[PDB]
């Protein structure tokens, strides 16, 4: 019954992309095998034999999403070779508004919303934090690294939200305060 | 009566947690409130205005909680301890609060009225912080609180209270 399943990579990848698509269309609370399968263009009967339940599918789909986010994250530090340059890169990450996009926000904050109800989704967030931490720890002590990532978490959102957000100058100064 | 209106506001928040913002309808809210469907029409016009009112009610409770952490604060060092307490207490980033707050955040870009709720909410927090901090520093602290409240309850190995304090003091300048 482990050997009943076939694990097709084409079907799998379609189901994963349709899952993210379903989250956008319906909200994370409302996604189901049925909705996903319809978006995916696969038989509903198929779904059970790739992912046992909705949480495991959600896990795979969001893991795909945070993988992409982490590549973008690391890419901001491509030219960093000291602490002040690291601070500049973090300022870029916040000021560029390329992380906190409408599309990215819609997906990540739905992940965050449901993660206290769904342990697999909390695991996704925990893995994602650890990757960001490991990136920052190239240039910062672990406590400072965690402080910066929390600052980035908050400031990327607030920057695109506030009626009157901070200047890049203000952002760089605050980042430099946190770096110590 | 106002008691029925409040039941409807509360059921809207309950419905957001059960169905997601996208799937919330007047009818789903009325059943959770346990009120006749006709009451939905009496008290509220659109589903978007109801969502606005319900989330506004939620952020007003959050702000009441936010201000309460500073009840014993008379200066900036004290404010740093209060902020550290707010984070370390995990009382802000509770499962219920997170499920409501992050759904609001999720849909803000698609729903202008909700974005207004978020902006109103961060202005109140800033106003609280600006009692002891410069406006720029107040915004930095509120963003740091936004991130660290969440990270503290999520991290497999979060920061200790003393570490949080030191970082709050760093941001405070």
Swiss-Prot record, chain B:
Task: Please list the residue ranges the record marks as binding DNA.
Answer: 25-44
> Which GO biological process categories is it annotated with?
DNA-templated transcription; positive regulation of DNA-templated transcription
* Domain called HTH tetR-type: residue spans: 2-62
What inducers act on this gene? Autoregulated.
Provide the GO MF annotations for this entry: DNA binding; DNA-binding transcription factor activity
Pfam families in the cross-refs: TetR_C_31, TetR_N
Going by the entry's taxonomy, the superkingdom of the source organism is recorded as Bacteria
What keywords would UniProt list here? DNA-binding, Transcription, Transcription regulation
Quote the function comment for this protein: Regulates the expression of a number of genes involved in biofilm formation and stress response. Target genes include six stress-response transcriptional regulators: csgD, which is a master regulator of biofilm formation, appY, sxy, ycgF, fimB and rcdA itself. This indicates that a large number of genes must be regulated indirectly via these transcriptional regulators. Acts by binding to the upstream region of its target genes.
More details: Has a strong cooperative DNA-binding mode, leading to aggregation of RcdA-DNA complexes.
The protein's name in its UniProt record: HTH-type transcriptional regulator RcdA
**Naturally occurring in which organism (per UniProt):** Escherichia coli (strain K12)
Q: Lineage in the entry?
A: Bacteria, Pseudomonadati, Pseudomonadota, Gammaproteobacteria, Enterobacterales
